[PDB]
């Protein structure tokens, strides 16, 4: 893992029956726990993003996490890895997502699949009324050989309110690595739309692990 | 809708990171609420079915339901239709699925996408320890113009026990139809493996609507 | 168990911080699966019922169930019994309840405790906007020696809509009885307010078990 | 609020049908976010604690939280307050709890009610196989005038594993106070049994609020 890394993404998604794909590129600093990427969403039925990109943001790599130089870094040791995330929204919307991260040189290849259903036709997701995720604290624990991550996330809404989403993630390594103690990952994710429709968008994440 | 109908199916799925596809054909009696179909699962990485087919069975059409000749048949009136189902398993496994049913002559075309994550590596699903679904009672209610279906299903296990799964489904019609009163759909689904691996399998469903 | 039985009830409850008690009397026909009772709610802080009585109705006896004269009647064989119910409302309200039923002659003594929290100050419960429960189908299954009951219930609302509540119940017998096959209990519960405030209210239930 | 405060507690509880009460006393430093208390559990049916005290620990006051001298302290401003907590355990156990905190001089009076059901007869709770809560990060957000707290907590188990519990709390002030920004409360709770049965036990909590 180098001080500076490159990224590439490809996503195959479906939300409320809407087929779509995503392409992206970015640059990040694994040791600093920072990264920035630019994405382009392509609706199968050519058109503007049909839902809040925020449902996708967290899917688009724990290698980009600042870990104390003592604590086992489950991610760094892996370098690939498989990710599986369950998103349970407070209004009945549910999304499942799984992805794989591979490394070629200084390039991280991220390939994912996303599938969301039961999102209210008029909720924050479908109506694109979200602004981004509130800073969160992801609790990392070990469960039967695999690293689990849990977080009661909050999607901020245009207007001021928030929309609750419970995240449950399984982090799987292709091979055995030294397991970490239970810990927490502090995150900051920011979304910046590059176009009105939100088809072109930029994402930045800042993450730091804390010994608890 | 004829007394006798033909069916064809195509599924694009992913479970715990495993890509797969499904093809099937069947015949059914819409008015009688009966149907029988034969499927063939093809694991992307050529091989035996990697998980319990029972997670897929309910995905593979409410037109095959016996409704009293008085009660509005939300399904029959539609004839296409979009389906969205959330499967929440008691052991953390979660699957989302969405499909579309179209009608050509006496042929029902069923195209679906399935995505499951967080299934315990050693649970009933991954270990293929299920036998089939226990007869259920699906509560149908109207919610903001759409027909909803809810059921606390039970997957029977080899050995005797059961594995709980809450089903939440949205039934959407391409156009407006006369809404039903809240009601219940009584179901019986039976799975019959045609080969050891369970790649080739047969399914039969019997469904009857009840005025409550 | 006689063809005609008498009932008496006493409840100690708390909802959103509101202490209250309940007293009731009724008569029922165990073999017919019918029963009618009259209750009187007393708010600790003297006053009108502070929330929908419907949250309490299902707490106020499976002995009042019509079972086929062949099928093991887990309830009848018991005659006492302990009940434990978890109520998970769709709007975040949660209620836990446990009760005991004892039998003296032709009199059923029902003693219960109810505790509800997180009900939206302005939801259907607190605002008393419910009308009653929609007819339901309670799925009965055996789980580790005890009879479990699950139901995705629907509280009907003034105006027309419905409010979802998942019921999860454990039925415990003081001693060993012949276990039933998984089955379903069809219910009809009706509430009739005897006074404006709803402090005095009448309840009637009709239940029939079905071999599935 | 003084630099040093005194506490007294009284709890009325029920778990899996077991009636019990609790009495306690402690001393704490509100500004430092520290506190220590000693409790004595009395089982209605005289005997050793029938379940893990850890289910009760978090019930036994956000005034004991270190807040930056700039950030609105929703708790301190209140000084009484009402608390409502929903505990959803991963194995089906559910507990609801509500309490009130009043202040007399340098004495905090804490009166609570606890009610738990559906805990597996042989799970970590009933079998008293827990050691304590893993350090957590409670996300505090505002929801319709009230402060909400959410946390995906982890009860550590004898042996090494953990048992998951989602905490959902409503914090209500008797009167209007300046609302905080969404934030996080970092906690450390430690339990020390003073007797074999765990009837006599000591608790210590350390809490610090973080501007996010």
Curated annotation (Swiss-Prot), chains A, B, C, D:
* Signal peptide region: none
- Impact of mutating residue 187 to T? Shifts fluorescence to 515 nm
Q: Which family does it belong to?
A: Belongs to the GFP family.
Which keywords does this Swiss-Prot/TrEMBL entry list? Answer: Chromophore, Luminescence, Photoprotein
Primary role:
Pigment protein that is green in color.
Explain how it is applied in biotechnology: Fluorescent proteins have become a useful and ubiquitous tool for making chimeric proteins, where they function as a fluorescent protein tag. Typically they tolerate N- and C-terminal fusion to a broad variety of proteins. They have been expressed in most known cell types and are used as a noninvasive fluorescent marker in living cells and organisms. They enable a wide range of applications where they have functioned as a cell lineage tracer, reporter of gene expression, or as a measure of protein-protein interactions.
Identify the InterPro entries for this entry: GFP, GFP-related, Green_fluorescent_prot
Tissue specificity remark? Tentacle tip.
Question: What is the name attached to this protein's record?
Answer: GFP-like fluorescent chromoprotein amFP486
Q: How is it modified after translation?
A: Contains a chromophore consisting of modified amino acid residues. The chromophore is formed by autocatalytic backbone condensation between Xaa-N and Gly-(N+2), and oxidation of Tyr-(N+1) to didehydrotyrosine. Maturation of the chromophore requires nothing other than molecular oxygen. The precise stereochemistry of the tyrosine has not been determined.
Is Endoplasmic reticulum tagged as a keyword?
no
Q: What Pfam families does its record include?
A: GFP
Any one biological process term the GO annotation gives:
generation of precursor metabolites and energy
């Amino acid at each position: 893992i180098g001080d500076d890394m490159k990224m590439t993404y490809h996503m195959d998604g479906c939300v409320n029956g809407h087929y779509f794909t995503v392409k992206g590129e970015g640059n990040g600093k694994p040791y600093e726990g920072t990264q920035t990427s630019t994405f382009k969403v392509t609706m199968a039925n050519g058109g503007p993003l049909a839902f809040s990109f925020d449902i996708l943001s967290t899917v688009f790599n724990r290698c980009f996490t600042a870990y104390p130089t003592s604590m086992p870094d489950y991610f760094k040791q892996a370098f690939g890895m498989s990710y599986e995330r369950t998103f349970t929204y407070e209004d009945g919307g549910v999304a499942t997502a799984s992805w794989e991260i591979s490394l070629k040189g200084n390039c991280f290849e991220h390939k994912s699949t996303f599938h969301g259903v039961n999102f209210p036709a008029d909720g924050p997701v479908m109506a694109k009324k979200t602004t981004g995720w509130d800073p969160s604290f992801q609790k990392m624990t070990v469960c039967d050989g695999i690293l689990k991550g849990d977080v009661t996330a909050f999607l901020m809404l245009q207007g001021g309110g928030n929309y609750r989403c419970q995240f449950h993630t399984s982090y799987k390594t292709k091979k055995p690595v030294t397991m970490p103690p239970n810990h927490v990952v502090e995150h900051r994710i920011a979304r910046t739309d590059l176009d009105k429709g939100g088809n072109s968008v930029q994402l930045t994440e800042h993450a730091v692990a804390h010994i608890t």
